[PDB]
Symmetry: D2
């Protein structure tokens, strides 16, 4: 039911293995904030799947062949050729990571006063749109806002919401559609191919451009092969290629599904926009021949993008996450459903029902998780939501969760068992989890540097 | 019950994942001999734990700092200090691998006509002893020859057999005692510290030298910490250091428990013997300052030897092997017991209790293992014996260190368990071709 | 007179070595624009010293120890401590490269309508300043605009021009002073410590902030040790530390003097400005704990920054550049003087004193350079200026660090010297295609 | 006249750069024996060209793709295929280095009482022959014994000496001919192709086998292309292939001309001997699929062997040595001539004519060289020659030299200038070089651990 790793371990990373009492000391000096823990003090780090992937022996061989030239690097040509072959786009501009490509796209395809619509948003993506004068509109289907609703392709765009938006505001004032695969805010939920072709059908009639946020497109491709009828016989690469046939371009973070620790790029088919793309990249990232990346990183990303297409790799990747979610749900632990492609979200509101949201249950759960197991997770509740500095009070989101984000090819099933067994043990005594009070709170981005103490 | 890996995966190795029909095609072209399979056609390669380990990021950092000088390399100085600190021997001579150290030891401590006794033997170790005029004598306890007997420290030396050997042959005709930790032939079985301390007591009374075959000494140390009373609070390093205090020297294959892919060394305390060791190393291995090893490999071995001392690494290593054995034993699959530190041995006699030993049950089982799952194993029965009929007819599933996961063990076990349920289908093979010596490597077969 | 490399070659990079007729074929398909040549078709690539350096074995060891965590990475802690120790600034924010730090600084220290003054400018630095509403004002000494004038510390700021700027415009409309070390536009020219100390004296009296463009600060430090009285006994590290004591912060491109292939950072002492710096870095570069850099790159940069402090490394780096200039100057080849720390600038005006500036003498010289020798150089004349007629029409031979030998410089010089003896044959080129902005990168040409 | 390096520096190795007074302190604590110096205390280490080479980026990429399997490694198949393609031999057995292959060859092709003849000898080669019951006979041309004689192909075998040996002793008692390329004892002197075909012509008539000691065959191949008429248009690989067409097998040390830091192999065409070769390799080196080498080393050696065939690489390699010899000879410094392919030999007898050989002039010159420049060289005179323990007195060789052995792709011309300028400066004050007395002398192999003090 769950496949073994379709690879061997080539090299390993040393970890501390400090005891529970030491982990408590480390958590106390970190202010009970997992963001302040030192990497060296962590057994299993589920803070993010961004840039934390394990590369292959082929990629590290490519790392030894870094053509570090300012222009005309062989590594760029290999990256360019790979992206044009697997994604099908005409032009590609490398960036140091995905948000670098998003900064370029927002300045190239947005006129001040226009609208941008897409299946929910991301923190950096929404900023570059809003910073450049756009107004974001969420047009995802309403089911994406139900955490417990176990349905497929929860990240599809509602065609009615898109159709109504075009009528009420006009197509000329619509910059583009930002279709993300997968949808991080709904929990890593996929978008069906049928939804993608419908979006292309509707936008093409009004001359409206479509751009993909393809950072986790391979995970999305696997869900299409597994759960959408008519794609069971098609390979991952074939599905990936067809997805992008319904887009005018894309922004990619290689730090995710390209199986590297740094890198991204920007794709598009329009020649004139690509000409302008090369003008802006020199002032933000670098020359269009390297774009803020060392040659060896372009090589590793080009190799990793080809490795991500292996069906066995992506099946194991998703099912390793599914294994963690299934073990938690089989014990009664409340999670967001369905389990996404890259992370399992613990519902801290139900986990810590004896605590109010003002006592930061997700933050206190994450601190308890690390002390019991050595596992770092991310608070994704009231603390991360921040304040509205105009009113001064907290922001209160519907989701008060703890995110267990699985880097690619870094951990085994036995590591997932360590995570699950500690959380399941925590759940059986969940009444002991204590609330936290702010001791230090910074002015902005409090999730990173704030400190707490038990109540 | 079984601990997770005390490390993260830093980089992975790509594998083929070829289907069953291809694996059968690959096995046919290999002549049904697992030794003839290509590495690229193998999902899980359990042929040996020699040199197949996965190194750490610290070791690969050391690999970038190869001081490749012919003499005075910093990497040699690191290795020398590390061995002198962890093992306690005065002198160390690096060799390209363990059998390189064995060639040196046999030529230095053996007079033609003398005897060498020890807890069973190894192929290259016994060869160099016999090459230099010695006669091997097995003095292991008799229980080590019963595969199913589940007792602790099965590799201990019988002191009565050793005492009788001294009387029947005389101490002067005894070159040395070759004490192996662990005992590979008995299934990876450990030697207790009490047996090591007792053997030193008896040999020292007759001026008999003792040399350890320390290739898997760390696995041995963990068994002492786990099963021998008086060592629960002592660290792996403390136990390893105490082990070697009862020996005049050792031969080490770093490819085993030093967590490297090449390398070994020879340790000793005698100054004159070390002086002669440096004379012999230049004509067989290389300068005593590098001994047939690159500087980066000496660095990797020094770091890996220190990493092996971490309790959690060595506990996980052994329990991953135990996990495979326990899953097979809980399904009724016949194995040699107790499970050793580095391998699980399938009892081909019981597994194929319908084919004669002349039908190559271990060899046919190993070929059948690969086609059903993609797992390479080693025949350890009549074919390896070359002396036609050994008591042990086994198939060895040897686990490299830090290379595979529990999910990989599950693939191995679940495939073998399904195979055992149809053990009547496993048939003997045709012999075909045999070389004069070491027939296991190049023989070829066909189904009947 | 010229010192040997204070290092050994650890690994080499394979090069093509294609003949002259192929190089001509390669140049024709490149449109006679050196920017359009493929790396694989180039023997000696002197296009830039940005990100083309060769790392050491210590740095590559650090590359194997990439702690790739999103927060709390050991590599960040190493980089932070190293910069705080060598530069003396309180806070550091890593960026993927120098212009990344410039984007942060310009948005944090510039009010729309204010002025920024400094010793000449850089393309990305001046852009981000103008992007945020500033107006650039060049306050370098006038001598820096004469290519042939051989004087020391040609990059010093004119204090009179700075004093007049304060009076004519007011200090409140001055965002900060952008002091670059070294000055790339003037030919890699250094700034004396006395000028740095004097500029801080004048700015501090009016509350004017000072920020350094420290991308080549180590080359600058060596010139202070070599040519400024009072610093002969002081170390490179001591000089670097004293340099930054006269600044409120700095932007660093590690791709230059930190001996790495990617990376940069932003330093400052103000706590509130650093607090805002961390808010802006997440939307442009990444978390303040990694800032768009892999952990292994932060490690490489921390090690490389410390390696750059070795006197023998930095002396050899500069004197290898000087060796190229001296060999060309001794043959009569016209260059900008004095030779800078990272590049030799061929004076295309004197080299082609028969072609007009509209015939692209620098661009035609650069294309001619490659076909005769296989050396890529950068046009630094009218085409890069995009503002049609600059005073300097030069060709830049930029030396990566630790990549080439004196024998490589000889190939460059001997080929250029032979070319100069036939400078009448170098002809102008056809313009063909120009993009709206930054025309140097994609223009194409043909011989007349 | 001297070509620049046909490669760029990809990565560098840190060195100490300690001053002259420190180097004197280091030399004193080393007992004035260069063999006892620490590698970290040396700027330019010219002790040997064995295993000290700098690998390429391609090789280090191959190092990341180590297939470490006990049997059937892809790296072995790549090594096997490369050797069969470039050398033309049917069978190959990897060994940890050349002397490992020589141990195998001596036990396979020598019956006790037989003779082995070849163009001079090497220390490890002669031992394995003599240890296995053979009697060595030097059949090199007499010109190889004249140090100052500047002639080409000084390492050719004298056909008369070979013809006379066959008549006086009989072919059945001749094990094989050991033709070494190049000849290390004569100073790295090459063997012509015409000499090789003549040796094959004479031996084949008597059924006498021929085996090459091809450790520096590429350097030998370059001399054939440069100095033997009729080979100016042929490539290095073509010349290498033709050389081995006149041999039944070879022993190779990859640590030399294969541009690696470890490795060797044994080649042959006889099937039955190869069957026996695989039996002996398991007890001395390892399985015939790896032979005492890690998979990554077999890969680096296979890649390096292909790189060694590039004409520009080998031309630069030889001419960098020639540059050092020419600079020394142009200043009057006495050297062995002609300059060999891998090293320059200083004639210490002429350099230190005020010292007798019992005062160890070569050893004292080497110590003075390091203190003045930071350059390690090897004494190749009375100290290395050792004693005859039967009589007790020293051995006294005709050659009292200091060997400056150049590793491949490690140093530049400026490093050669450092070597030459220091030695030339030493020569101008050569009367100051003082003799040394033994303070500690070991029983055997005194060159490695003996210590001295000035007289
Ligand atoms: K990362
Ligand atoms: K191996
Ligand atoms: K670069
Ligand atoms: K070496």
């Amino acid at each position: 039911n769950y496949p073994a790793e379709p690879f061997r371990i080539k090299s390993v990373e040393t970890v501390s293995m400090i005891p529970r009492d030491e982990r408590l000391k480390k958590m106390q000096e970190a202010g009970y904030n997992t963001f302040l823990l030192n990497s060296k003090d962590i057994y299993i780090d589920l803070l993010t799947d961004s840039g934390t992937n394990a590369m292959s022996d082929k990629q590290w061989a490519g790392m030894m062949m870094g053509d570090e030239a300012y222009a005309g690097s062989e590594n760029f040509y290999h990256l360019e050729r790979t992206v044009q072959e697997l994604f099908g786009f005409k032009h590609i501009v490398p960036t140091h990571q995905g948000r670098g490509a998003e900064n370029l796209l927002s300045q190239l395809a947005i006129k001040p006063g226009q609208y941008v619509a897409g299946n929910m948003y991301f923190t950096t993506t929404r900023y570059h749109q809003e910073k450049n004068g756009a107004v974001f509109v969420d047009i995802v289907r309403d089911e994406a806002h139900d955490a417990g609703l176990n349905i497929a392709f929860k990240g599809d765009i509602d065609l009615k919401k898109l159709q109504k938006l075009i009528d009420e505001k006009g197509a000329e004032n619509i910059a583009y559609i930002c279709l993300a695969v997968t949808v991080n805010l709904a929990g890593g939920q996929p978008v069906s191919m049928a939804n993608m072709r419908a979006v292309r059908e509707l936008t093409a009639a009004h001359g409206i451009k479509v751009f993909y946020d393809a950072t986790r497109c391979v995970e999305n491709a696997y869900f299409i092969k597994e759960q959408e009828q008519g794609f069971e016989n098609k390979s991952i690469a074939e599905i990936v290629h067809e997805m992008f046939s319904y887009a005018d371009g894309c922004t990619m973070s290689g730090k995710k599904d390209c199986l590297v620790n740094i890198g991204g790029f920007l794709c598009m088919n329009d020649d004139e926009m690509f000409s302008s793309a090369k003008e802006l990249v020199v002032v933000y990232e670098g020359m269009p021949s390297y774009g803020g990346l060392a040659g060896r990183d372009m090589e590793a990303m080009a190799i990793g993008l080809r490795e991500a297409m292996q069906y066995e790799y992506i099946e194991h990747r998703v099912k390793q996450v599914r294994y963690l979610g299934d073990k938690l749900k089989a014990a009664g632990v409340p999670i967001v459903e369905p389990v996404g492609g890259h992370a399992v979200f613990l519902d801290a509101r139900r986990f810590c029902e004896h605590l109010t949201q003002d006592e930061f249950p997700a933050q206190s759960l994450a601190a308890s998780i690390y002390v019991e197991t050595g596992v770092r997770s991310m608070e994704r509740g009231i603390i991360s939501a921040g304040r509205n500095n105009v009113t001064g009070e907290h922001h209160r989101p519907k989701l008060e969760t703890v995110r267990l984000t699985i880097p690619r090819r870094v951990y085994t099933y036995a590591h997932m068992d360590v995570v699950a067994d500690g959380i399941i043990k925590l759940y059986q005594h969940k009444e002991d989890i204590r609330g936290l009070k702010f001791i230090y709170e910074p002015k902005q981005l409090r999730a990173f540097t704030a400190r707490f103490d038990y109540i």
